[PDB]
Design a binder for this molecule. Structure first.
Ligand SMILES: CNc1nc(F)nc2c1ncn2Cc1cccc(Cl)c1
Length: 164
């Protein structure tokens, strides 16, 4: 069913995450962590304190798809267990130094062709697939986007709900 999912998304905030490579999204799915540039790191830490759930919706550049979505379970923290991100061209390990813990809600893909009817008011009502890394997605758009993903029957949202 989808009732617990809708409960988790209630009054959530949503942010688009754009990764330059698949390897880092695979690492994030394996380890439950994400790192972004300092400008977006500050936005996510503020959002984490402001909302019952902060949802990251992931898309690998040039893939034509979203690869899943996850809920922040912490603010960013430095110095914990390190992470071997595959660093793009203009990217240093100090830029990805802040590590957020995340709980995956859906690890399944959604092609951009399926979200063509959703536009994001916070990005000039462009299709929700359009946006830079860190772009916030308005509540109703983000809720409908997350509900379009195939159900991930491997995930039990009971433990996620308790963190709220
Ligand atoms: C583990 N975190 C990440 N991994 C990868 F691969 N791309 C990321 C990323 N966070 C953001 N981007 C997009 C981006 C923005 C500006 C400049 C570059 Cl070079 C890449």
């Amino acid at each position: 069913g989808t009732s617990k999912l809708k409960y988790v998304l209630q009054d959530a905030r949503f942010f688009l995450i754009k990764s330059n490579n698949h390897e880092n999204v695979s690492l994030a799915k394996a380890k439950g962590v994400w790192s972004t540039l300092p400008v977006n790191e500050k936005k996510l830490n503020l959002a984490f304190r402001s909302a019952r759930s902060v949802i990251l919706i992931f898309s690998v550049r040039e893939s034509g798809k979203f690869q899943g979505f996850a809920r922040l379970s912490s603010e960013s923290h430095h110095g914990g267990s390190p992470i071997h991100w595959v660093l793009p061209a203009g990217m240093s390990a100090k830029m990805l130094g802040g590590v957020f813990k995340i709980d995956w809600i859906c690890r399944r893909e959604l092609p951009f062709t399926k979200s063509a009817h959703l536009t994001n008011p916070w990005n000039e009502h462009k299709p929700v697939k359009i946006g830079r890394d860190g772009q916030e997605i308005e509540l109703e758009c983000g809720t409908q986007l997350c509900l379009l993903f195939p159900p991930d029957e491997s995930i039990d949202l009971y433990q996620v709900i308790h963190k709220m």
